[PDB]
Scaffold this active site. Sequence first.
Site, PDB file in Angstrom:
ATOM      1  N   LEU A  20       0.822  -1.214   0.000  1.00 21.50           N
ATOM      2  CA  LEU A  20       0.000   0.000   0.000  1.00 21.50           C
ATOM      3  C   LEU A  20       0.854   1.262   0.000  1.00 21.50           C
ATOM      4  O   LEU A  20       0.413   2.320  -0.439  1.00 21.50           O
ATOM      5  CB  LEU A  20      -0.934   0.022   1.207  1.00 21.50           C
ATOM      6  CG  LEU A  20      -1.937  -1.126   1.280  1.00 21.50           C
ATOM      7  CD1 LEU A  20      -2.801  -1.015   2.520  1.00 21.50           C
ATOM      8  CD2 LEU A  20      -2.796  -1.176   0.028  1.00 21.50           C
ATOM      9  N   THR A  22       4.755   3.246   1.834  1.00 18.67           N
ATOM     10  CA  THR A  22       5.707   3.322   2.921  1.00 18.67           C
ATOM     11  C   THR A  22       5.559   4.642   3.653  1.00 18.67           C
ATOM     12  O   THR A  22       5.490   5.706   3.037  1.00 18.67           O
ATOM     13  CB  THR A  22       7.141   3.217   2.400  1.00 18.67           C
ATOM     14  OG1 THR A  22       7.306   1.975   1.711  1.00 18.67           O
ATOM     15  CG2 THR A  22       8.137   3.307   3.546  1.00 18.67           C
ATOM     16  N   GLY A  26       7.695   2.527   8.151  1.00 13.74           N
ATOM     17  CA  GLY A  26       8.013   1.628   7.076  1.00 13.74           C
ATOM     18  C   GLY A  26       6.790   1.245   6.283  1.00 13.74           C
ATOM     19  O   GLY A  26       5.825   2.007   6.185  1.00 13.74           O
ATOM     20  N   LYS A  42       0.996  -3.106   9.197  1.00 13.86           N
ATOM     21  CA  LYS A  42       2.022  -2.068   9.311  1.00 13.86           C
ATOM     22  C   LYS A  42       3.300  -2.705   9.824  1.00 13.86           C
ATOM     23  O   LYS A  42       3.335  -3.196  10.947  1.00 13.86           O
ATOM     24  CB  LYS A  42       1.586  -0.972  10.293  1.00 13.86           C
ATOM     25  CG  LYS A  42       0.274  -0.294   9.957  1.00 13.86           C
ATOM     26  CD  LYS A  42      -0.292   0.475  11.160  1.00 13.86           C
ATOM     27  CE  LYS A  42       0.548   1.695  11.513  1.00 13.86           C
ATOM     28  NZ  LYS A  42       0.371   2.807  10.527  1.00 13.86           N
ATOM     29  N   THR A  86      -4.434  -3.738  11.516  1.00 22.54           N
ATOM     30  CA  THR A  86      -5.566  -2.831  11.635  1.00 22.54           C
ATOM     31  C   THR A  86      -6.621  -3.104  10.581  1.00 22.54           C
ATOM     32  O   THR A  86      -6.441  -3.892   9.639  1.00 22.54           O
ATOM     33  CB  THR A  86      -5.167  -1.338  11.497  1.00 22.54           C
ATOM     34  OG1 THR A  86      -4.896  -1.032  10.121  1.00 22.54           O
ATOM     35  CG2 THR A  86      -3.948  -1.019  12.319  1.00 22.54           C
ATOM     36  N   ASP A 133      -1.408  14.013  16.975  1.00 21.17           N
ATOM     37  CA  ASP A 133      -0.921  14.401  15.648  1.00 21.17           C
ATOM     38  C   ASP A 133      -2.046  14.322  14.612  1.00 21.17           C
ATOM     39  O   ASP A 133      -1.921  13.723  13.545  1.00 21.17           O
ATOM     40  CB  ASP A 133       0.280  13.543  15.225  1.00 21.17           C
ATOM     41  CG  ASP A 133       0.958  14.054  13.962  1.00 21.17           C
ATOM     42  OD1 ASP A 133       0.780  15.227  13.588  1.00 21.17           O
ATOM     43  OD2 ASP A 133       1.682  13.253  13.329  1.00 21.17           O
ATOM     44  N   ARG A 137      -3.144  13.709   6.785  1.00 20.45           N
ATOM     45  CA  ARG A 137      -2.183  12.648   6.483  1.00 20.45           C
ATOM     46  C   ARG A 137      -2.350  11.459   7.436  1.00 20.45           C
ATOM     47  O   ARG A 137      -1.816  10.373   7.171  1.00 20.45           O
ATOM     48  CB  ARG A 137      -0.749  13.181   6.558  1.00 20.45           C
ATOM     49  CG  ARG A 137      -0.309  13.505   7.960  1.00 20.45           C
ATOM     50  CD  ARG A 137       1.135  14.016   8.043  1.00 20.45           C
ATOM     51  NE  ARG A 137       1.346  14.645   9.343  1.00 20.45           N
ATOM     52  CZ  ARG A 137       1.020  15.904   9.635  1.00 20.45           C
ATOM     53  NH1 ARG A 137       0.504  16.705   8.716  1.00 20.45           N
ATOM     54  NH2 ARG A 137       1.221  16.361  10.860  1.00 20.45           N
ATOM     55  N   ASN A 138      -3.062  11.666   8.542  1.00 19.44           N
ATOM     56  CA  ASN A 138      -3.327  10.606   9.525  1.00 19.44           C
ATOM     57  C   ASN A 138      -4.785  10.187   9.555  1.00 19.44           C
ATOM     58  O   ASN A 138      -5.272   9.669  10.560  1.00 19.44           O
ATOM     59  CB  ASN A 138      -2.855  11.034  10.929  1.00 19.44           C
ATOM     60  CG  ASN A 138      -1.353  10.963  11.074  1.00 19.44           C
ATOM     61  OD1 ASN A 138      -0.707  10.088  10.478  1.00 19.44           O
ATOM     62  ND2 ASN A 138      -0.782  11.877  11.845  1.00 19.44           N
ATOM     63  N   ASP A 151      -3.829   6.002  13.569  1.00 16.54           N
ATOM     64  CA  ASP A 151      -2.556   6.200  14.268  1.00 16.54           C
ATOM     65  C   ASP A 151      -2.655   7.152  15.464  1.00 16.54           C
ATOM     66  O   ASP A 151      -1.703   7.850  15.810  1.00 16.54           O
ATOM     67  CB  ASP A 151      -1.472   6.617  13.280  1.00 16.54           C
ATOM     68  CG  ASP A 151      -1.058   5.470  12.367  1.00 16.54           C
ATOM     69  OD1 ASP A 151      -1.463   4.318  12.641  1.00 16.54           O
ATOM     70  OD2 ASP A 151      -0.338   5.731  11.389  1.00 16.54           O
TER      71      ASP A 151
HETATM   72  N1  LIG Z   1      -5.343   0.735   7.009  1.00 17.41           N
HETATM   73  C1  LIG Z   1      -5.155   0.720   5.701  1.00 17.41           C
HETATM   74  O1  LIG Z   1      -5.769   0.003   4.917  1.00 17.41           O
HETATM   75  C2  LIG Z   1      -4.156   1.635   5.110  1.00 17.41           C
HETATM   76  C3  LIG Z   1      -4.263   1.888   3.757  1.00 17.41           C
HETATM   77  C4  LIG Z   1      -3.353   2.734   3.164  1.00 17.41           C
HETATM   78  C5  LIG Z   1      -2.366   3.316   3.935  1.00 17.41           C
HETATM   79  N2  LIG Z   1      -1.507   4.134   3.282  1.00 17.41           N
HETATM   80  C6  LIG Z   1      -0.357   4.725   3.921  1.00 17.41           C
HETATM   81  C7  LIG Z   1      -0.224   6.206   3.557  1.00 17.41           C
HETATM   82  C8  LIG Z   1       1.111   6.790   4.012  1.00 17.41           C
HETATM   83  C9  LIG Z   1       2.294   5.956   3.535  1.00 17.41           C
HETATM   84  C10 LIG Z   1       2.147   4.511   3.986  1.00 17.41           C
HETATM   85  C11 LIG Z   1       0.853   3.932   3.442  1.00 17.41           C
HETATM   86  N3  LIG Z   1      -2.268   3.063   5.263  1.00 17.41           N
HETATM   87  C12 LIG Z   1      -3.149   2.238   5.864  1.00 17.41           C
END
Ligand SMILES: NC(=O)c1ccc(NC2CCCCC2)nc1
Length: 271
Positions: A20, A22, A26, A42, A86, A133, A137-138, A151
Amino acid sequence: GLGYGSWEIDPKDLTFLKELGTGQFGVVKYGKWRGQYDVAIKMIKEGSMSEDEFIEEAKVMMNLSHEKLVQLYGVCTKQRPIFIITEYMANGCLLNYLREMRHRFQTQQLLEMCKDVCEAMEYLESKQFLHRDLAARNCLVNDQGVVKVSDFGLSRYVLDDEYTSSVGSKFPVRWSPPEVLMYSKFSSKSDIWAFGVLMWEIYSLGKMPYERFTNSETAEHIAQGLRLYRPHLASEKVYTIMYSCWHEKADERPTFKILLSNILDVMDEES
Ligand SMILES: NC(=O)c1ccc(NC2CCCCC2)nc1
């Protein structure tokens, strides 16, 4: 089973399907748990996280459950890297989603994204749990277009000091109230401030807040009492709500319960 506590997932139960992207810690992958259940995995890069502290906190996060909060299912900690498992969010990061102009969003959809986040935050506030935070982006978006908060609290376990204090090059200056930038005073009201900035991000279709300023310049601007101004897509009533999150005096800022009421009222009036 044997060898696993309630917060622990057996990594052997995972099937990996898609990468998906980084992020900070990571790589994040899409997969299945026990063949059938969609999960995100993750993978926490070695040296990036205070892992023992996070694992103890995972036990608390296990008990946070709300429809607008990305669900923690468990952790895989018997090897490295450790995994956080998750809920899967098929449409990815909110910031990227906002920036895709093909969606041609109606403002009612933008307000609903704000409400999604506000509901999650009201729930966290009811549990005396700070995000610490909050930002687009979160947040993540599922296959139905529902936005969920992701997160929450995780910044407490980041070892890269560039992220961890305002004296740091990767600190979220543009989402921080004056008392955080000046004195490191975090509270419910610093989450409130961040939520206002997130509303601004949503209504701005993912522009960077204070887009022509550096972080240093942003800190000066806001400490001097100046603010973001109204995104073109925000009505006066919507602007009033986001702006209320930025009172110089933290105790004059609303609660998430109040913001939710205000958002519902505007939905009703703008529907
Ligand atoms: N919980 C999920 O399905 C999920 C889907 C996409 C995602 N993308 C992140 C965006 C920032 C960079 C690392 C990938 N993170 C989590």
